[PDB]
Every structure is written in structure tokens, then in C-alpha cells.
């Protein structure tokens, strides 16, 4: 059997699988490292409702203006800390309690512009 906290994630996961309980987001809270060089990183700061985007020299935060769960997908509308003009849409699709797939789309000024992103790809939550 796995460690305690690990089971809690699976327990929490089960409540979101068919349970469709309020929070699937609770599984996102923490550090996520991209799969497939230097790995892009996502940290979902639950306390401050932020999402920090990192890749070496690249580091930046977007405050969550909204967040909605549907089935197995959390859809974020985030906004840059410095400039309100620059925002970012996220499509976090869970595969497992510690495995997701992210799609990101920038939104400068007010029209969303959506080619492939450096943040697009599979992520796995960090565990020691």
C-alpha cells in the first residue's frame, strides 16, 4: 500500500471521479512538472488562488479570476500580476490524481490568441 497522503489524493480523486464533489481543484494545489531539456513548471497556489509559470529564466504569476470544473477538466481564467491586459486561459485535464494534461492560450488586450504554447503538454505532480 502507498503512503498516507498519497491515499488521500486517491481518496480525494475518487470523490471527483463520479462523485462530482465541489472541489477537484484541491488535487491541483502543488507543484507540477512537465513530461517530454528544461521542464516547464506549474504551481497552483491554492491559498492565494494563483498559478506560477516557470522555466528557468522564465518566472511569472497569474491570479485566478475564475475557475470551473466539469467532469475531468478544470478551466481557468487567469490574469498577469503586473499587467491586467495580459491574461491566460488554461485547460487542465486530469488523467490521474497526479497526472494531468494542460493546454494554455494567451489573451492580450481582449481577443484570445491561441497557437501552441510552451506550457502545453503532460504534467506530473511532484512527490518524494
Numbering used by the authors: 96 to 131, 138 to 229
Text lifted from the article:
One protein suggested to play a role in T. pallidum dissemination within the host is Tp0751 (also referred to as pallilysin). This protein is a primary target of opsonic antibodies, and thus is predicted to be surface-exposed on T. pallidum, and it binds and degrades host components encountered by T. pallidum during dissemination. The Treponema pallidum protein, Tp0751, possesses adhesive properties and has been previously reported to mediate attachment to the host extracellular matrix components laminin, fibronectin, and fibrinogen. Herein we demonstrate that Tp0751 adopts an eight-stranded beta barrel-containing lipocalin structure, and using a peptide library approach we show that the extracellular matrix component adhesive functionality of Tp0751 is localized to the lipocalin domain.
We also mutated Glu199 to Ala to stabilize the protein for crystallization studies. We next crystallized and determined the three dimensional structure of Tp0751_78A using selenium single wavelength anomalous dispersion (SAD) phasing to a resolution of 2.15 Å. Structural analysis revealed that the C-terminal domain of Tp0751_78A adopts a compact eight-stranded antiparallel beta-barrel with +1 topology, capped by a short 310-like helix and a longer N-terminal helix. The first ordered residue in the Tp0751_78A structure was Gln96 indicating the N-terminal residues Ser78 to Thr95 were either disordered or proteolyzed in the crystal. Analysis clearly revealed an intact N-terminal extension present in the Tp0751_78A crystals indicating that the lack of electron density for the N-terminal residues in the structure reflects disorder and not proteolysis. Comparison of the Tp0751_78A structure against the database of known structures using the DALI server revealed a striking similarity to lipocalin domains, specifically nitrophorins. Ultimately, the classification of Tp0751 as an outlier lipocalin domain, as opposed to a kernel lipocalin, is based on the observation that is does not contain all three SCRs. The SCR1 in Tp0751 localizes to the 310 helix and Strand A, centered on a GxW motif (Gly125 and Trp127 in Tp0751). Although SCR3 is distal in amino acid sequence, residing on Strand H, the key basic residue in this region (Arg226 in Tp0751) stacks on top of the SCR1 Trp and forms a hydrogen bond to the backbone carbonyl of the preceding coil. Although Loop 1 of Tp0751_78A is exposed and partially disordered in the structure, there is no discernable hydrophobic pocket, primarily because Loop 7 caps the hydrophobic core with a stacked Trp-Met pair (right).
